[PDB]
Subunit: 194 residues, 3 copies
Amino acid sequence: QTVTILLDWFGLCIFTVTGALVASRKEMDIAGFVLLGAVTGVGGGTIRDLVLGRTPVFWVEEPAYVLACLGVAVFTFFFAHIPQSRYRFLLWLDAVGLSLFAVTGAERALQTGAGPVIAIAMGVATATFGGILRDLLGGESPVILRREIYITAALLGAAAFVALDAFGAPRELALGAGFAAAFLSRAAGLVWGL
Amino acid sequence: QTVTILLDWFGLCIFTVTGALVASRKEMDIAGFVLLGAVTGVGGGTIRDLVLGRTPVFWVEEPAYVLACLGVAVFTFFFAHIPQSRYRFLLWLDAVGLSLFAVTGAERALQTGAGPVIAIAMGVATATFGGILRDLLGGESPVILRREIYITAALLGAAAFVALDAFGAPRELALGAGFAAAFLSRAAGLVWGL
Amino acid sequence: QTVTILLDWFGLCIFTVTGALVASRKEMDIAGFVLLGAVTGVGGGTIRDLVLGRTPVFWVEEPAYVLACLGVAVFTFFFAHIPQSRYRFLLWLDAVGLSLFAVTGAERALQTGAGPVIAIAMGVATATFGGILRDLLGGESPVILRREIYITAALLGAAAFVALDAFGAPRELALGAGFAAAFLSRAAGLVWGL
Protein backbone atom coordinates (compact mmCIF):
# COMPACT_ATOMS: atom_id res chain seq x y z
CA GLN A 1 0.00 0.00 0.00
CA THR A 2 1.27 3.43 -1.00
CA VAL A 3 -2.17 5.04 -0.81
CA THR A 4 -1.86 5.91 2.87
CA ILE A 5 1.56 7.46 2.35
CA LEU A 6 -0.16 9.73 -0.16
CA LEU A 7 -2.90 10.46 2.36
CA ASP A 8 -0.21 11.42 4.87
CA TRP A 9 1.52 13.67 2.34
CA PHE A 10 -1.83 15.35 1.69
CA GLY A 11 -2.54 15.70 5.40
CA LEU A 12 0.85 17.30 5.98
CA CYS A 13 0.42 19.53 2.92
CA ILE A 14 -3.16 20.59 3.63
CA PHE A 15 -2.46 21.27 7.30
CA THR A 16 0.60 23.20 6.15
CA VAL A 17 -1.71 25.40 4.08
CA THR A 18 -3.92 25.81 7.13
CA GLY A 19 -1.05 27.06 9.26
CA ALA A 20 0.37 29.21 6.48
CA LEU A 21 -2.96 30.85 5.74
CA VAL A 22 -3.39 31.35 9.49
CA ALA A 23 -0.05 33.14 9.30
CA SER A 24 -1.67 35.19 6.54
CA ARG A 25 -4.49 36.13 8.91
CA LYS A 26 -1.96 37.34 11.48
CA GLU A 27 -0.06 39.38 8.88
CA MET A 28 3.04 37.34 9.74
CA ASP A 29 6.17 37.21 7.59
CA ILE A 30 7.07 34.35 5.22
CA ALA A 31 9.15 32.62 7.92
CA GLY A 32 5.91 32.60 9.88
CA PHE A 33 4.27 30.73 7.01
CA VAL A 34 7.08 28.17 6.90
CA LEU A 35 7.36 27.67 10.66
CA LEU A 36 3.67 27.64 11.55
CA GLY A 37 2.92 25.52 8.49
CA ALA A 38 5.58 23.02 9.50
CA VAL A 39 4.30 22.93 13.09
CA THR A 40 0.69 22.32 12.07
CA GLY A 41 1.35 19.89 9.21
CA VAL A 42 3.99 17.87 11.03
CA GLY A 43 2.77 18.36 14.61
CA GLY A 44 0.02 15.75 14.78
CA GLY A 45 2.25 13.06 13.32
CA THR A 46 5.21 14.15 15.44
CA ILE A 47 3.22 13.89 18.70
CA ARG A 48 1.84 10.56 17.49
CA ASP A 49 5.32 9.18 16.84
CA LEU A 50 6.57 10.59 20.14
CA VAL A 51 3.98 8.82 22.28
CA LEU A 52 4.02 5.65 20.14
CA GLY A 53 7.81 5.52 20.43
CA ARG A 54 8.94 6.11 16.85
CA THR A 55 12.53 7.39 16.78
CA PRO A 56 13.64 9.35 14.98
CA VAL A 57 10.48 11.27 14.09
CA PHE A 58 9.20 11.03 10.50
CA TRP A 59 10.32 14.49 9.38
CA VAL A 60 13.82 14.17 10.85
CA GLU A 61 14.07 10.65 9.42
CA GLU A 62 13.21 12.14 6.04
CA PRO A 63 13.57 15.95 5.77
CA ALA A 64 11.37 16.04 2.66
CA TYR A 65 8.29 16.33 4.88
CA VAL A 66 9.40 19.69 6.26
CA LEU A 67 10.53 20.81 2.78
CA ALA A 68 7.06 20.16 1.43
CA CYS A 69 5.80 22.49 4.13
CA LEU A 70 8.49 25.00 3.20
CA GLY A 71 7.23 24.64 -0.32
CA VAL A 72 3.52 24.79 0.43
CA ALA A 73 3.80 27.53 3.03
CA VAL A 74 5.79 29.70 0.63
CA PHE A 75 3.22 28.91 -2.05
CA THR A 76 0.46 29.99 0.31
CA PHE A 77 2.36 33.20 1.01
CA PHE A 78 1.80 34.16 -2.61
CA PHE A 79 -1.72 32.77 -2.83
CA ALA A 80 -3.07 33.91 0.53
CA HIS A 81 -4.40 37.08 -1.10
CA ILE A 82 -6.59 35.16 -3.54
CA PRO A 83 -9.12 33.32 -1.38
CA GLN A 84 -11.48 35.15 0.97
CA SER A 85 -12.81 34.13 3.31
CA ARG A 86 -9.63 32.27 4.22
CA TYR A 87 -11.11 30.93 7.48
CA ARG A 88 -13.62 28.92 5.46
CA PHE A 89 -10.70 27.29 3.68
CA LEU A 90 -9.27 26.74 7.15
CA LEU A 91 -12.38 24.86 8.20
CA TRP A 92 -12.70 22.69 5.08
CA LEU A 93 -9.00 21.90 4.72
CA ASP A 94 -8.98 21.12 8.44
CA ALA A 95 -11.87 18.73 7.79
CA VAL A 96 -10.00 16.91 5.02
CA GLY A 97 -6.73 16.67 6.93
CA LEU A 98 -8.79 15.62 9.95
CA SER A 99 -10.30 12.71 8.06
CA LEU A 100 -7.10 11.53 6.40
CA PHE A 101 -5.06 11.85 9.60
CA ALA A 102 -7.76 10.11 11.62
CA VAL A 103 -7.80 7.11 9.31
CA THR A 104 -4.09 6.88 8.47
CA GLY A 105 -3.24 7.73 12.07
CA ALA A 106 -5.38 4.86 13.31
CA GLU A 107 -3.72 2.67 10.68
CA ARG A 108 -0.12 3.35 11.65
CA ALA A 109 -1.08 3.22 15.31
CA LEU A 110 -2.49 -0.25 14.64
CA GLN A 111 0.47 -1.60 12.67
CA THR A 112 2.78 -0.73 15.56
CA GLY A 113 1.35 -3.48 17.74
CA ALA A 114 -0.99 -1.33 19.81
CA GLY A 115 -4.63 -2.03 20.61
CA PRO A 116 -7.71 -0.80 18.69
CA VAL A 117 -8.46 1.83 21.33
CA ILE A 118 -4.92 3.21 21.01
CA ALA A 119 -5.43 3.22 17.24
CA ILE A 120 -8.58 5.31 17.48
CA ALA A 121 -6.96 7.56 20.07
CA MET A 122 -4.03 8.26 17.73
CA GLY A 123 -6.40 8.74 14.83
CA VAL A 124 -8.18 11.49 16.72
CA ALA A 125 -4.83 12.73 18.04
CA THR A 126 -2.97 13.35 14.77
CA ALA A 127 -5.77 15.45 13.30
CA THR A 128 -6.84 17.24 16.46
CA PHE A 129 -3.34 18.05 17.70
CA GLY A 130 -2.36 19.02 14.16
CA GLY A 131 -5.04 21.69 14.40
CA ILE A 132 -4.27 22.42 18.06
CA LEU A 133 -0.69 23.53 17.55
CA ARG A 134 -1.58 26.00 14.79
CA ASP A 135 -4.55 27.38 16.73
CA LEU A 136 -2.50 27.77 19.91
CA LEU A 137 0.54 29.41 18.36
CA GLY A 138 -1.73 31.50 16.14
CA GLY A 139 -3.28 33.11 19.21
CA GLU A 140 -6.92 32.53 18.27
CA SER A 141 -9.53 30.27 19.87
CA PRO A 142 -9.24 26.66 18.60
CA VAL A 143 -11.79 24.95 16.35
CA ILE A 144 -12.38 22.26 18.98
CA LEU A 145 -14.26 24.66 21.27
CA ARG A 146 -16.96 25.18 18.66
CA ARG A 147 -19.84 22.88 17.77
CA GLU A 148 -20.17 20.13 17.18
CA ILE A 149 -18.46 17.27 15.38
CA TYR A 150 -14.71 18.04 15.17
CA ILE A 151 -13.62 15.33 17.61
CA THR A 152 -16.47 12.97 16.68
CA ALA A 153 -15.61 13.08 12.98
CA ALA A 154 -12.10 11.81 13.69
CA LEU A 155 -13.53 9.49 16.33
CA LEU A 156 -16.02 7.82 13.99
CA GLY A 157 -13.46 7.86 11.19
CA ALA A 158 -10.88 5.97 13.24
CA ALA A 159 -13.53 3.79 14.87
CA ALA A 160 -15.02 2.85 11.50
CA PHE A 161 -11.53 2.08 10.22
CA VAL A 162 -10.66 -0.18 13.14
CA ALA A 163 -14.12 -1.77 13.17
CA LEU A 164 -13.99 -2.68 9.49
CA ASP A 165 -10.37 -3.80 9.75
CA ALA A 166 -11.22 -6.05 12.69
CA PHE A 167 -13.38 -8.29 10.49
CA GLY A 168 -10.53 -8.44 7.99
CA ALA A 169 -12.12 -6.36 5.25
CA PRO A 170 -9.85 -5.03 2.56
CA ARG A 171 -7.93 -2.19 4.21
CA GLU A 172 -8.47 0.17 1.27
CA LEU A 173 -12.22 0.32 1.88
CA ALA A 174 -11.53 0.74 5.60
CA LEU A 175 -9.51 3.80 4.61
CA GLY A 176 -12.27 5.00 2.30
CA ALA A 177 -15.06 4.43 4.82
CA GLY A 178 -13.03 6.05 7.58
CA PHE A 179 -12.32 9.08 5.40
CA ALA A 180 -15.98 9.19 4.36
CA ALA A 181 -17.47 8.77 7.83
CA ALA A 182 -15.17 11.55 9.01
CA PHE A 183 -15.25 14.09 6.18
CA LEU A 184 -18.95 13.76 5.37
CA SER A 185 -19.99 13.96 9.02
CA ARG A 186 -17.85 17.06 9.61
CA ALA A 187 -19.04 18.61 6.34
CA ALA A 188 -22.67 18.30 7.42
CA GLY A 189 -21.96 20.48 10.44
CA LEU A 190 -19.87 22.89 8.42
CA VAL A 191 -22.82 23.15 6.04
CA TRP A 192 -25.50 23.66 8.68
CA GLY A 193 -23.21 25.88 10.75
CA LEU A 194 -22.27 28.13 7.84
CA GLN B 1 4.06 -1.35 46.93
CA THR B 2 0.79 -1.10 45.02
CA VAL B 3 -0.35 2.00 46.90
CA THR B 4 1.32 4.41 44.49
CA ILE B 5 -0.18 2.65 41.49
CA LEU B 6 -3.54 3.37 43.10
CA LEU B 7 -2.52 6.98 43.65
CA ASP B 8 -1.64 7.20 39.96
CA TRP B 9 -4.97 5.67 38.95
CA PHE B 10 -6.71 8.25 41.13
CA GLY B 11 -4.62 11.08 39.71
CA LEU B 12 -5.46 10.02 36.17
CA CYS B 13 -9.13 9.55 37.07
CA ILE B 14 -9.52 12.79 39.02
CA PHE B 15 -7.70 14.85 36.40
CA THR B 16 -9.90 13.14 33.83
CA VAL B 17 -12.93 14.46 35.70
CA THR B 18 -11.32 17.89 35.73
CA GLY B 19 -10.90 17.91 31.96
CA ALA B 20 -14.32 16.38 31.34
CA LEU B 21 -16.09 18.88 33.58
CA VAL B 22 -14.09 21.63 31.86
CA ALA B 23 -15.56 20.23 28.65
CA SER B 24 -18.91 20.63 30.40
CA ARG B 25 -18.15 24.30 31.00
CA LYS B 26 -17.42 24.79 27.30
CA GLU B 27 -20.64 23.01 26.29
CA MET B 28 -18.50 20.54 24.33
CA ASP B 29 -19.73 17.18 23.04
CA ILE B 30 -19.03 13.81 24.70
CA ALA B 31 -15.96 13.24 22.50
CA GLY B 32 -14.73 16.48 24.03
CA PHE B 33 -15.12 14.92 27.47
CA VAL B 34 -13.20 11.82 26.44
CA LEU B 35 -10.41 13.62 24.58
CA LEU B 36 -9.86 16.51 26.98
CA GLY B 37 -10.18 14.15 29.94
CA ALA B 38 -7.59 11.84 28.44
CA VAL B 39 -5.24 14.74 27.69
CA THR B 40 -5.45 16.16 31.21
CA GLY B 41 -5.39 12.87 33.12
CA VAL B 42 -2.66 11.28 31.05
CA GLY B 43 -0.76 14.42 30.01
CA GLY B 44 1.34 15.03 33.11
CA GLY B 45 2.50 11.43 33.24
CA THR B 46 3.03 11.31 29.48
CA ILE B 47 5.30 14.40 29.51
CA ARG B 48 7.08 12.95 32.54
CA ASP B 49 7.76 9.67 30.77
CA LEU B 50 8.78 11.51 27.60
CA VAL B 51 11.49 13.59 29.27
CA LEU B 52 12.57 10.75 31.60
CA GLY B 53 12.88 8.42 28.62
CA ARG B 54 10.15 5.86 29.26
CA THR B 55 9.16 4.13 26.02
CA PRO B 56 6.51 3.29 25.24
CA VAL B 57 4.44 5.72 27.30
CA PHE B 58 2.33 4.30 30.15
CA TRP B 59 -1.05 4.59 28.41
CA VAL B 60 0.17 3.05 25.14
CA GLU B 61 1.97 0.35 27.11
CA GLU B 62 -1.34 -0.39 28.81
CA PRO B 63 -4.45 1.06 27.09
CA ALA B 64 -6.51 0.67 30.27
CA TYR B 65 -5.35 4.11 31.41
CA VAL B 66 -7.05 5.84 28.50
CA LEU B 67 -10.12 3.59 28.87
CA ALA B 68 -10.51 4.71 32.46
CA CYS B 69 -10.59 8.25 31.14
CA LEU B 70 -13.09 7.18 28.49
CA GLY B 71 -15.07 5.72 31.34
CA VAL B 72 -14.75 8.63 33.74
CA ALA B 73 -15.20 11.32 31.11
CA VAL B 74 -18.38 9.67 29.88
CA PHE B 75 -19.50 9.34 33.49
CA THR B 76 -18.85 13.04 33.99
CA PHE B 77 -20.87 13.79 30.86
CA PHE B 78 -23.92 12.46 32.67
CA PHE B 79 -23.02 13.93 36.05
CA ALA B 80 -21.77 17.34 34.96
CA HIS B 81 -25.26 18.76 35.46
CA ILE B 82 -25.34 17.79 39.14
CA PRO B 83 -22.58 19.81 40.77
CA GLN B 84 -22.51 23.61 40.67
CA SER B 85 -20.25 25.36 40.95
CA ARG B 86 -18.20 22.96 38.84
CA TYR B 87 -15.11 25.20 38.93
CA ARG B 88 -14.87 24.64 42.68
CA PHE B 89 -14.72 20.91 41.99
CA LEU B 90 -12.07 21.79 39.42
CA LEU B 91 -9.98 23.51 42.07
CA TRP B 92 -10.30 20.82 44.75
CA LEU B 93 -9.88 17.84 42.42
CA ASP B 94 -6.92 19.66 40.89
CA ALA B 95 -5.51 19.97 44.42
CA VAL B 96 -5.86 16.24 45.11
CA GLY B 97 -4.43 15.15 41.77
CA LEU B 98 -1.71 17.76 42.29
CA SER B 99 -0.69 16.21 45.59
CA LEU B 100 -0.81 12.59 44.44
CA PHE B 101 1.00 13.34 41.17
CA ALA B 102 3.61 15.43 42.96
CA VAL B 103 4.45 12.64 45.37
CA THR B 104 4.12 9.64 43.04
CA GLY B 105 5.77 11.64 40.27
CA ALA B 106 8.75 12.36 42.49
CA GLU B 107 8.78 8.68 43.42
CA ARG B 108 8.90 7.26 39.90
CA ALA B 109 11.32 9.99 38.89
CA LEU B 110 13.56 8.82 41.74
CA GLN B 111 13.37 5.10 41.00
CA THR B 112 14.56 5.75 37.45
CA GLY B 113 18.06 6.64 38.61
CA ALA B 114 17.70 10.40 38.50
CA GLY B 115 18.71 12.88 41.18
CA PRO B 116 16.52 14.32 43.97
CA VAL B 117 16.17 17.64 42.16
CA ILE B 118 14.93 15.84 39.04
CA ALA B 119 12.52 13.93 41.27
CA ILE B 120 11.03 17.12 42.70
CA ALA B 121 10.96 18.70 39.25
CA MET B 122 8.96 15.77 37.87
CA GLY B 123 6.72 15.80 40.91
CA VAL B 124 5.79 19.39 40.21
CA ALA B 125 5.70 18.62 36.48
CA THR B 126 3.15 15.79 36.40
CA ALA B 127 0.58 17.73 38.40
CA THR B 128 1.20 21.16 36.92
CA PHE B 129 1.39 20.03 33.30
CA GLY B 130 -1.60 17.78 33.88
CA GLY B 131 -3.53 20.93 34.71
CA ILE B 132 -1.75 22.96 32.03
CA LEU B 133 -2.90 20.90 29.07
CA ARG B 134 -6.57 21.01 30.08
CA ASP B 135 -6.43 24.75 30.83
CA LEU B 136 -4.68 25.51 27.54
CA LEU B 137 -6.91 23.42 25.29
CA GLY B 138 -9.96 24.58 27.26
CA GLY B 139 -9.25 28.18 26.27
CA GLU B 140 -9.43 29.68 29.76
CA SER B 141 -6.69 31.21 31.90
CA PRO B 142 -4.71 28.53 33.80
CA VAL B 143 -4.85 28.01 37.57
CA ILE B 144 -1.11 28.65 37.84
CA LEU B 145 -1.52 32.37 37.16
CA ARG B 146 -3.60 32.82 40.30
CA ARG B 147 -2.42 33.03 43.89
CA GLU B 148 -0.68 31.56 45.58
CA ILE B 149 0.39 28.00 46.34
CA TYR B 150 -0.31 25.84 43.25
CA ILE B 151 3.35 25.28 42.34
CA THR B 152 4.55 25.42 45.96
CA ALA B 153 2.12 22.72 47.07
CA ALA B 154 3.58 20.27 44.56
CA LEU B 155 7.04 21.64 45.32
CA LEU B 156 6.81 21.04 49.07
CA GLY B 157 5.03 17.75 48.47
CA ALA B 158 7.80 16.40 46.27
CA ALA B 159 10.50 18.02 48.41
CA ALA B 160 9.07 16.52 51.59
CA PHE B 161 8.87 13.14 49.87
CA VAL B 162 12.48 13.22 48.70
CA ALA B 163 13.70 14.70 52.00
CA LEU B 164 12.06 11.99 54.09
CA ASP B 165 13.12 9.27 51.65
CA ALA B 166 16.72 10.48 51.79
CA PHE B 167 17.03 9.48 55.45
CA GLY B 168 15.58 6.09 54.57
CA ALA B 169 12.21 6.49 56.26
CA PRO B 170 9.49 4.08 55.30
CA ARG B 171 8.36 5.19 51.84
CA GLU B 172 4.67 4.93 52.72
CA LEU B 173 4.91 7.79 55.23
CA ALA B 174 6.96 9.75 52.70
CA LEU B 175 3.99 9.34 50.37
CA GLY B 176 1.57 10.33 53.12
CA ALA B 177 3.59 13.35 54.25
CA GLY B 178 4.12 14.46 50.67
CA PHE B 179 0.40 14.18 49.94
CA ALA B 180 -0.38 15.96 53.21
CA ALA B 181 2.15 18.78 52.82
CA ALA B 182 0.77 19.34 49.32
CA PHE B 183 -2.99 18.94 49.72
CA LEU B 184 -3.28 20.69 53.10
CA SER B 185 -1.12 23.62 52.01
CA ARG B 186 -3.12 24.09 48.80
CA ALA B 187 -6.41 23.67 50.68
CA ALA B 188 -5.50 26.49 53.05
CA GLY B 189 -5.25 28.88 50.12
CA LEU B 190 -8.38 27.50 48.51
CA VAL B 191 -10.13 28.11 51.83
CA TRP B 192 -8.85 31.65 52.37
CA GLY B 193 -9.23 32.48 48.69
CA LEU B 194 -12.81 31.23 48.46
CA GLN C 1 35.03 23.24 21.29
CA THR C 2 33.60 24.33 24.63
CA VAL C 3 32.39 27.69 23.30
CA THR C 4 29.02 26.34 22.21
CA ILE C 5 28.45 24.68 25.56
CA LEU C 6 28.89 28.14 27.05
CA LEU C 7 26.47 29.56 24.50
CA ASP C 8 23.95 26.91 25.55
CA TRP C 9 24.46 27.71 29.23
CA PHE C 10 23.84 31.37 28.41
CA GLY C 11 20.77 30.55 26.34
CA LEU C 12 19.33 28.48 29.17
CA CYS C 13 20.24 31.15 31.72
CA ILE C 14 18.98 34.13 29.72
CA PHE C 15 15.74 32.40 28.76
CA THR C 16 15.40 31.45 32.42
CA VAL C 17 15.55 35.15 33.27
CA THR C 18 12.93 35.79 30.60
CA GLY C 19 10.52 33.30 32.13
CA ALA C 20 11.28 34.39 35.68
CA LEU C 21 10.76 38.06 34.90
CA VAL C 22 7.57 37.09 33.08
CA ALA C 23 6.59 35.45 36.37
CA SER C 24 7.37 38.84 37.90
CA ARG C 25 4.93 40.48 35.50
CA LYS C 26 2.20 38.05 36.56
CA GLU C 27 2.90 38.66 40.26
CA MET C 28 3.58 34.93 40.61
CA ASP C 29 5.34 33.33 43.58
CA ILE C 30 8.99 32.24 43.62
CA ALA C 31 8.05 28.68 42.59
CA GLY C 32 6.54 30.36 39.55
CA PHE C 33 9.93 31.90 38.81
CA VAL C 34 11.68 28.55 39.13
CA LEU C 35 9.13 26.53 37.17
CA LEU C 36 8.44 28.99 34.36
CA GLY C 37 12.14 29.81 34.13
CA ALA C 38 12.99 26.14 33.84
CA VAL C 39 10.29 25.59 31.21
CA THR C 40 11.44 28.50 29.05
CA GLY C 41 15.19 28.00 29.43
CA VAL C 42 15.12 24.24 29.02
CA GLY C 43 12.05 23.93 26.77
CA GLY C 44 13.58 24.71 23.39
CA GLY C 45 16.45 22.30 23.93
CA THR C 46 14.15 19.67 25.42
CA ILE C 47 11.81 19.72 22.39
CA ARG C 48 14.87 19.68 20.13
CA ASP C 49 16.27 16.60 21.85
CA LEU C 50 12.85 14.95 21.86
CA VAL C 51 12.33 15.21 18.11
CA LEU C 52 16.01 14.53 17.31
CA GLY C 53 15.91 11.43 19.50
CA ARG C 54 18.27 12.32 22.33
CA THR C 55 17.53 10.20 25.41
CA PRO C 56 17.66 11.04 28.17
CA VAL C 57 17.08 14.77 27.73
CA PHE C 58 19.97 17.13 28.54
CA TRP C 59 18.61 18.41 31.86
CA VAL C 60 17.72 14.95 33.17
CA GLU C 61 21.08 13.64 31.94
CA GLU C 62 22.71 16.43 33.95
CA PRO C 63 20.46 18.10 36.57
CA ALA C 64 22.77 21.14 36.75
CA TYR C 65 20.86 22.73 33.87
CA VAL C 66 17.65 22.93 35.89
CA LEU C 67 19.60 24.04 38.99
CA ALA C 68 21.02 26.96 37.06
CA CYS C 69 17.45 27.94 36.30
CA LEU C 70 16.57 27.46 39.96
CA GLY C 71 19.49 29.72 40.68
CA VAL C 72 18.78 32.34 38.04
CA ALA C 73 15.03 32.37 38.57
CA VAL C 74 15.49 32.89 42.30
CA PHE C 75 18.03 35.59 41.51
CA THR C 76 15.51 37.26 39.24
CA PHE C 77 12.92 37.06 42.01
CA PHE C 78 15.07 39.46 44.00
CA PHE C 79 16.10 41.59 41.04
CA ALA C 80 12.78 41.79 39.21
CA HIS C 81 11.98 45.02 41.05
CA ILE C 82 15.06 46.79 39.70
CA PRO C 83 14.58 46.96 35.95
CA GLN C 84 11.58 48.69 34.37
CA SER C 85 10.43 48.25 31.77
CA ARG C 86 10.95 44.52 32.24
CA TYR C 87 9.31 43.67 28.90
CA ARG C 88 12.13 45.47 27.10
CA PHE C 89 14.57 43.16 28.87
CA LEU C 90 12.28 40.35 27.75
CA LEU C 91 12.66 41.41 24.13
CA TRP C 92 16.43 41.90 24.17
CA LEU C 93 17.25 38.81 26.24
CA ASP C 94 14.90 36.88 23.96
CA ALA C 95 16.92 38.22 21.02
CA VAL C 96 20.23 37.05 22.50
CA GLY C 97 18.95 33.62 23.49
CA LEU C 98 17.29 33.45 20.08
CA SER C 99 20.60 33.99 18.32
CA LEU C 100 22.65 31.64 20.47
CA PHE C 101 20.01 28.90 20.38
CA ALA C 102 19.56 29.30 16.64
CA VAL C 103 23.26 28.83 15.97
CA THR C 104 24.09 26.21 18.60
CA GLY C 105 20.79 24.47 17.89
CA ALA C 106 21.67 24.22 14.21
CA GLU C 107 25.10 22.97 15.26
CA ARG C 108 23.95 20.13 17.48
CA ALA C 109 21.23 19.29 14.99
CA LEU C 110 23.96 18.97 12.36
CA GLN C 111 26.36 16.85 14.41
CA THR C 112 23.61 14.30 14.98
CA GLY C 113 23.69 13.17 11.36
CA ALA C 114 20.71 15.15 10.13
CA GLY C 115 20.52 17.29 7.00
CA PRO C 116 21.17 21.05 6.72
CA VAL C 117 17.45 21.80 6.50
CA ILE C 118 16.84 19.88 9.73
CA ALA C 119 19.72 21.83 11.27
CA ILE C 120 18.16 25.18 10.39
CA ALA C 121 14.74 23.94 11.48
CA MET C 122 16.11 22.99 14.91
CA GLY C 123 18.00 26.26 15.12
CA VAL C 124 14.77 28.17 14.68
CA ALA C 125 12.99 25.65 16.90
CA THR C 126 15.11 25.86 20.07
CA ALA C 127 14.86 29.65 20.25
CA THR C 128 11.28 30.03 19.07
CA PHE C 129 9.84 27.21 21.18
CA GLY C 130 11.93 28.39 24.12
CA GLY C 131 10.01 31.65 23.88
CA ILE C 132 6.75 29.89 23.00
CA LEU C 133 6.45 27.88 26.19
CA ARG C 134 6.97 30.90 28.45
CA ASP C 135 4.57 33.05 26.42
CA LEU C 136 1.90 30.35 26.39
CA LEU C 137 2.06 29.44 30.07
CA GLY C 138 2.39 33.12 30.95
CA GLY C 139 -1.00 33.82 29.41
CA GLU C 140 0.06 36.73 27.21
CA SER C 141 0.27 36.99 23.42
CA PRO C 142 3.56 35.54 22.08
CA VAL C 143 6.37 37.62 20.55
CA ILE C 144 6.07 35.69 17.29
CA LEU C 145 2.76 37.34 16.39
CA ARG C 146 4.40 40.76 16.26
CA ARG C 147 6.54 42.23 13.50
CA GLU C 148 8.76 41.41 11.95
CA ILE C 149 12.00 39.44 12.23
CA TYR C 150 11.69 37.02 15.18
CA ILE C 151 11.57 33.86 13.06
CA THR C 152 13.78 35.30 10.30
CA ALA C 153 16.55 36.22 12.73
CA ALA C 154 16.85 32.60 13.87
CA LEU C 155 16.30 31.49 10.28
CA LEU C 156 19.15 33.58 8.86
CA GLY C 157 21.29 32.78 11.88
CA ALA C 158 20.96 29.03 11.40
CA ALA C 159 21.09 29.34 7.61
CA ALA C 160 24.27 31.43 7.76
CA PHE C 161 25.77 28.90 10.16
CA VAL C 162 25.00 25.92 7.94
CA ALA C 163 25.97 27.81 4.77
CA LEU C 164 29.37 28.80 6.12
CA ASP C 165 29.92 25.35 7.64
CA ALA C 166 29.11 23.71 4.31
CA PHE C 167 32.22 25.19 2.69
CA GLY C 168 34.25 23.97 5.64
CA ALA C 169 34.99 27.33 7.22
CA PRO C 170 36.22 27.34 10.77
CA ARG C 171 33.15 26.56 12.88
CA GLU C 172 33.88 29.33 15.38
CA LEU C 173 33.28 32.04 12.77
CA ALA C 174 30.17 30.17 11.64
CA LEU C 175 28.98 30.50 15.23
CA GLY C 176 29.95 34.17 15.31
CA ALA C 177 28.36 35.00 11.96
CA GLY C 178 25.22 33.07 12.86
CA PHE C 179 24.95 34.89 16.18
CA ALA C 180 25.64 38.20 14.43
CA ALA C 181 23.25 37.71 11.52
CA ALA C 182 20.58 36.78 14.06
CA PHE C 183 21.11 39.25 16.91
CA LEU C 184 21.91 42.28 14.75
CA SER C 185 18.98 41.67 12.41
CA ARG C 186 16.55 41.27 15.33
CA ALA C 187 18.04 44.30 17.10
CA ALA C 188 17.39 46.49 14.07
CA GLY C 189 13.68 45.75 14.32
CA LEU C 190 13.69 46.13 18.08
CA VAL C 191 15.33 49.53 17.53
CA TRP C 192 12.95 50.74 14.82
CA GLY C 193 9.96 49.20 16.58
CA LEU C 194 10.75 50.76 19.95
